[PDB]
Paper text:
Dimeric CoMsrA was purified after substrate treatment to determine its crystal structure. The asymmetric unit contained one dimer and one monomer comprised of 204 residues (residues 5–208). The monomer in the asymmetric unit makes a dimer with a symmetric molecule. The area of the dimer interface was 1160 Å2 per monomer, corresponding to approximately 11% of the monomer’s surface area. The two catalytic domains from the pair of monomers face each other around the two catalytic Cys16 residues and occupy most of the dimer interface, whereas the helical domain lies distant from the interface. Interestingly, a central cavity is present in the surface model of the dimer, with a diameter of ~9 Å and a depth of ~12 Å. The two Cys16 residues constitute the base of the hole. However, although the two Cys16 residues were located close to each other in the dimeric [name] structure within the asymmetric unit, no disulfide bond was observed. Thus, we speculate that the disulfide bond would be cleaved by intense synchrotron radiation. Interestingly, the active site pocket no longer exists in the dimeric [name] with significant changes in the conformation of L1 and L2 loops.
Numbering used by the authors:
A (entry chain A), B (entry chain A): 5 to 208
């Protein structure tokens, strides 16, 4: 009922959304634009914003430390770009995150003698990305998608769900099918649906 | 000595560059920006351009028909965006490509009763993307990268090479290691290098 929120920025948000969304402890994901000053970001109209991701996670299952580790492994900001704006950003929500981040950045910068160009700033506003970016890899496979969209009875219902992130994670080649079968039963849906959902899945 | 060139656009060019670059018959890849009118595209300054990819392929091994099939499977442009600009574009270089494309688009639009919003226009200019986008997933793994960068004796030498595309393809989870071992010997480099290159590879 009460969870924790991380807001990261690491280039295109498709990869992340399908990566984080396949990690255990990750409850939900939304991709969007954060870091800028305009009130109207869109995919080709960022202004000063950056392609970002908001991860709703359970601190009892996954730490902000683990997340930061994934964050700096999913990309390499060890090059100076930082052109016009910043591709690599960490948006902290409380001082807890701000200090772990400022510390872990200091760790790699020391353990590698190589300056990391990740920005650590306070989250001012996260602007939600257009619907065709939400659970991208999932939305592409249109049969699995339209099936799940019905089961959850709405677009928004699906993309907030943990299961979509896992599916979208699996399709992107970021999940062993066995783990998907687990996350599938954790919903406990009527067997007709299950088999049908699982049906599209075994045909790969 | 003489090859064929396809120029596609399908969203972020990282995925593609690592996908196409792992298909047999694909000689080289460059990511960049095409489709616009400004003479100065960059990652956050596209103008009217779109994130594009240029694939140098061998028509004796792979057809433009096969490429177009990969192109329309790697993404789903069956949604109307097409916002401000066009994410999904096919840049033809000769009438051969223009007709296969205009035909294959007509095929799916019929076989699915669903309008594809891919643009088919003549290639006017392909602007090369910044170096940190070239063989992205490869450049991230900094040991394998700096090793290969030395073997090829230059940055540009590596990214034009077939092997980098295959490596960058493998790292992105788009290649069975066995196929990488093949593409590795097709270069016939001194065994000290081989084993060292293969060494970083088995540690995954």
């Amino acid at each position: 009922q009460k969870l924790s929120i991380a807001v990261f920025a690491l280039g295109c948000f498709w990869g992340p959304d399908a990566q984080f969304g396949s990690i255990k402890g990750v409850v939900s994901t939304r991709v969007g634009y954060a870091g800028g000053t305009t009130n109207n970001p869109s995919y080709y109209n960022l202004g000063d914003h950056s392609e970002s991701i908001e991860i709703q996670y359970d601190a009892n299952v996954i730490t902000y430390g683990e997340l930061l580790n994934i964050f700096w492994n999913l990309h390499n900001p060890v090059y100076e770009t930082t052109n016009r704006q910043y591709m690599s950003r960490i948006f902290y929500l409380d001082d807890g995150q701000k200090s772990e981040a400022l510390e872990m950045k200091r760790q790699i910068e020391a353990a590698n003698g190589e300056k990391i160009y990740t920005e650590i700033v306070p989250l001012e506003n996260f602007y939600l990305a257009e619907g065709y970016h939400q659970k991208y890899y999932l939305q592409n496979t249109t049969k699995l998608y339209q099936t799940l969209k019905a089961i959850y009875g709405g677009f928004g219902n699906l993309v907030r769900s943990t299961l979509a992130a896992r599916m979208n994670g699996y399709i992107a080649g970021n999940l062993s099918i066995a783990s998907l079968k687990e996350e599938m039963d954790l919903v406990e849906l009527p067997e007709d649906q299950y088999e049908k959902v699982l049906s599209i899945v075994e045909e790969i």
